[PDB]
Amino acid sequence: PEEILERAKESLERAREASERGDEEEFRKAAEKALELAKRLVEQAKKEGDPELVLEAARVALWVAELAAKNGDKEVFKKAAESALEVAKRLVEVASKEGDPDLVAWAALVALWVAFLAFLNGDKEVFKKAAESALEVAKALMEVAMKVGAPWLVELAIAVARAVWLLAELFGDEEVRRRAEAFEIILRIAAIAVKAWLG
């Protein structure tokens, strides 16, 4: 994972330099190499039981995504966002498996950041994918909160729902906005339930 991480970082540097200079071939090549290396690192994380590696792969994926938006190359941006959301899902899975809150919060932040990058570039499709992943992460976040105490997870989940709603508000995807509003309502109910259970 260490050599993998360093190679992925150097490829990200290549991609940033190619974006500043204005390359495409090296741009997409280093980008997809970084995503392949990040997926390989995610594989290594589960084969060797390391959660932090998943988070770092997510961060690497996020960096690649941000670069695409500055660059604007959508063809690679979509692949990067798909990778980032998949890594977020894997993070949720391993966190619910182990019972570690911080991983869930990082998953929620990764989902929301993919959403924000979409909102910046203006890609309604990946925006919907991101919002769906974020609401799913809110689900799993409330569930973990119920499982392992940590009341602040409840507040974080409600706030993530509100954030998804407001982001859909600015962008305009009323479908996503309706999903988010209904989810905030039902999550307020579940929140009162879990708070009473634990506290």
Place this chain on the structure above:
Amino acid sequence: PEEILERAKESLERAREASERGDEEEFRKAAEKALELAKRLVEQAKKEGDPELVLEAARVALWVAELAAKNGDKEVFKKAAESALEVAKRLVEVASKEGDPDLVAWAALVALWVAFLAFLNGDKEVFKKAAESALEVAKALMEVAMKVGAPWLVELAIAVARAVWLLAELFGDEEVRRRAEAFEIILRIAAIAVKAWLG
């Protein structure tokens, strides 16, 4: 119940894989097998006096329902929601029988989640069924609260009424909305009564 639970879980995995790959025959087959197994597990729960089994069958039913909405296959979604509401009713029954609050709260959450899935898919019929079941659960929730103390049940019941109202607001079923508003009023009254009684 254990082997039953594992078989139902594996059938749910089959259904999820069939939904991602895009199957229908295996999709509906594994789905209805999961519902049949969940109903069998509900039977086993009462024949062997286990409440938690009812909750797990509800969760399994809920998972199947969510999948239908992602999939969109309404013909199975309606059966799944009917099963989920019936399991919620059984949960209310056994909870009022024993005097266990947590079961009632889980029933309310199951009803509201069926409602939210309906709101997502946009099926006004099952939405009305879900809202009615939820208000009934609020009734039984206030009743138990009066029976076994636990004041937080009162707040949960009022909040469930408010949630049903707001969900009907977003969807638009003004009939359900009127039922919910009137129910919130009369429940505020009953709430002041029960709070004075217990506290």
Place this chain on the structure above:
Amino acid sequence: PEEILERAKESLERAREASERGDEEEFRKAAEKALELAKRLVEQAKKEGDPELVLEAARVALWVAELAAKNGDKEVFKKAAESALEVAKRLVEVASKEGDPDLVAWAALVALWVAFLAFLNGDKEVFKKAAESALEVAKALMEVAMKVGAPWLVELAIAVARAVWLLAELFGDEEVRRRAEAFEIILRIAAIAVKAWLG
């Protein structure tokens, strides 16, 4: 009263099964048998000085009423609501006779529940009867509060007035709404008087 109560309960079960299956003859027959048995039980309560029997007869009557609304058979629903309001009046009478607050609160809740069932079915006539009975119960509630202390009865009475007003608001019976608003005003005055007297 015990055998009477069990027979009334079994008749209620008959009525529920007939409503689910879709009967009318057995429906109305078991319903009117339940009401006759509940009135007989009310008789037994006074002849043997038992208040709780009155409350249980009220509950049985309420159950029959709810069933009519799900069923929609108005011809029996009106008789059931008339019975329920009469039982509420008897409850008020015996409570003011003995000086027991809880009975008065249960009377208020029974009146409001008859009102809510009317609002559900949409029968303005019985709605007016229910609202009148509820305001009368608020009168007697303030009176008892003055008699036997228990300040919370004051808050309950004001809240019942507000609830009658809001229910008339949703339904639309402006006459009942005006009665309720005027009654809330004069009850706020009486409330300040009684609070100063006792506290």
Place this chain on the structure above:
Amino acid sequence: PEEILERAKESLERAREASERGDEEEFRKAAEKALELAKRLVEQAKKEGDPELVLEAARVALWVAELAAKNGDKEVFKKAAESALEVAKRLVEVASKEGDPDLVAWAALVALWVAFLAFLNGDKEVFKKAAESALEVAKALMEVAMKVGAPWLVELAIAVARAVWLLAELFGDEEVRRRAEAFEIILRIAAIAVKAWLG
């Protein structure tokens, strides 16, 4: 007074039964007999120095008035309200004579209840008479408060003024409403004066 009270109560029972059955001759006869007996009891109260008798005569008069409104027989209702207001005036007189607060508060409540009965039946004339009597009672209430301490009388007086205003608001007698608003202003001033004096 005791035999007088019992005879008046039995006549009230006659009147209630005649109202339920639908009589007029016995209705008005028992009603006017009850009012005559209540006035006789008021006479007995002053000739034998008993304040509580005045309050009970007021209550009896109030009961007769309520019955008229349910019945709707205005020709007797006006006489009943005139009697009730006169008894309220006598109560104010004897209370200011002795220096007993509770009697004044009961007078205010009697006046407001006559007003509310008028508002129910819709008789603007007696409504104006009632509002005038109520404002007069507020005057005497502030005066007693200044005389015998008891600060809560001040709050009760201001609240009675506000109640008269709101009742005139619902009914519509803008003249009475203007009287009440001006009276509330000047009573707020007098209230600050009396509070500073006593406290």
Place this chain on the structure above:
Amino acid sequence: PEEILERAKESLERAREASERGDEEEFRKAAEKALELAKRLVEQAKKEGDPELVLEAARVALWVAELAAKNGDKEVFKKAAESALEVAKRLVEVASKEGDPDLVAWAALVALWVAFLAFLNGDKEVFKKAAESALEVAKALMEVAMKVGAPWLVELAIAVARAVWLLAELFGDEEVRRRAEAFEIILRIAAIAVKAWLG
């Protein structure tokens, strides 16, 4: 003063009886006799240094004024209000002479009550006279407050200004309203000054 007071009281009783029966000659005769006797009593108060006599003469004058409004005889009502305001001025004078707060507050209340009686009868002329006298009393009230401590006089003065403003608001005399608003502003300033001085 004692025999004078009793004769004035008996003349007031004559006037009340004449108003109920509907007299004019005896009405005006007893009224002007009462006012003459009250002025004689005011004379006696200063010749024998008794402040309370002034207050009682004011009360007697106020009673006569109220009666005129119920009666509506304006020709005597104007004389009564002129007398009452003059007695209020004399009360202010003697209070500032001696340094007794309660007398000033009673003067303010007398002025406001004359104003309220005018507002009832609807005589804009005497209304303006009353408002002017009330603002003058507020002036002298702040002055005394500065002289003899007693901070509550400050709050009473500001409240009297606000009351004059609101009364002019309901009646409509915009000139008086403007005077009152400007006076409230300058009195808030003087109030902050006096509060800082004393406290």
Place this chain on the structure above:
Amino acid sequence: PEEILERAKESLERAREASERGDEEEFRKAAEKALELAKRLVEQAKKEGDPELVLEAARVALWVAELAAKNGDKEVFKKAAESALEVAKRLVEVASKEGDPDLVAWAALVALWVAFLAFLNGDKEVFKKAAESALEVAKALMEVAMKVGAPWLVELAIAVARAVWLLAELFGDEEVRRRAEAFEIILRIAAIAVKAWLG
């Protein structure tokens, strides 16, 4: 100063009697004699170092001004207001010379009272003169506050600015209103500065 004060007071009594009777020659004569005597008394105050004499001369001038407004004789009212404002300026001067807060507050009140008298009579010219003098007094008030502590002077100055603004609001002199608003802003700044300095 004593004989001067008594002669000025007697001349003021002459003027009041002449105003009630309706004189002009004696009215203006006693008025201008009172103003001449008050100016002579102001001279005596500085020649013999007595501040209170200045305040009493101001009060005498204020009394003359009030009388003009009741009378309405503008030709003398303008001279009286000019005298009063000049006395206020002299009061500010001697107060800043000695360092005595109360004198400054009395100056502010005198200026505002001249303003209020103008607002009553409706003389926009002297109103502007009064507002200018009042804002100047607010300046000197903040300055003294900075000099001799006494934080309440700060609040008094801000309140005087607000009062000048509101008075200009009612009257309508938008120029004066703009001056006052700007002055309130800059005085809030100076107030935060002085509060931090002292406290």
Place this chain on the structure above:
Amino acid sequence: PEEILERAKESLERAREASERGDEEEFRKAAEKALELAKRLVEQAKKEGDPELVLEAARVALWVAELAAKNGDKEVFKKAAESALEVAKRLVEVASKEGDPDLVAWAALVALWVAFLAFLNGDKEVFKKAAESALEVAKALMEVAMKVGAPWLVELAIAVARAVWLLAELFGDEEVRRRAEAFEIILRIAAIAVKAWLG
């Protein structure tokens, strides 16, 4: 500096007398002599290291400016305001050199007072110069606050920004208003930074 200060004061007295009498030649002559003497005194202050002399020269300049506005002679008013702003700049310089807060606050007040005088006379040009100098003083005020503690400087700076904004609001120079609003925003940020740093 002492003889210089006295000569400048006497020239200011000459200018005030010439303004009251209505002179121009002596008016402008004494004015420009006062400004020349104040600049000479500013020179003396730095050559002999005395900050208070700068403040007194500023005050003298401010007095001359005020006089111009009462007089209205713009040709000298502009020179006076230019001098006052330059003295304010010098005050800021020497204060930041030494590290003395009070001098900075006095600079801000001088700038705002020049602004207020401009707003009075209505000279948009010098108004813009004053607002710019005031915002510059706010900059240096935050900087000193960061340098020498004294948190109240932060609040004073924010308040000066708000005051500049409101003054531009009343006058109408939307450009200055936009500068001030943006400056208030960025100063709120810098304020949170400095508060966290020090406190």
Place this chain on the structure above:
Amino acid sequence: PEEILERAKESLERAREASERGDEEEFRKAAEKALELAKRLVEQAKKEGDPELVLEAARVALWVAELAAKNGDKEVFKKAAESALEVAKRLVEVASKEGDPDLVAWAALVALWVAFLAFLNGDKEVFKKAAESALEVAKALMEVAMKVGAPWLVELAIAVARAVWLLAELFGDEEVRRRAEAFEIILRIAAIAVKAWLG
């Protein structure tokens, strides 16, 4: 760095004098010399590991930028702002490298000040560059806050986001405004996460 700093300061003095006198050749020459010297000083800072040198170079760059806006020479202003933003980026880099909060806050303030200078001059291009750099600094600020404690960094980051939004509001660059609003939402989420993590 010391001689470099002094030479850069003297060149800044040359530029200020040339701006007041109205030069262009010396203006741009001293300006670009100052920027070259500041970049050389930034080089020296990293080659000799001194963070404060970076901040001083930023301050020097900021001073040059301000001067351009007063001067209005855009051709040099753009280069100055580019330099300032690059220095801000370098400051963020070295701060995240070492783990020193104050440097990050200074970077945010530098970015916002470049933005404010742009808003003053009205150059939408550099305004967008500045807003982007500021949001990037907010990102790195939250990241450091998570890294090295110091909760106040969280509040500073949220406030910087709000400030960028409001600045875009006044100027009008709705694109930048949308970026800022979305960033504030996602930063509120990240803020709740980091606060829960640390505190």
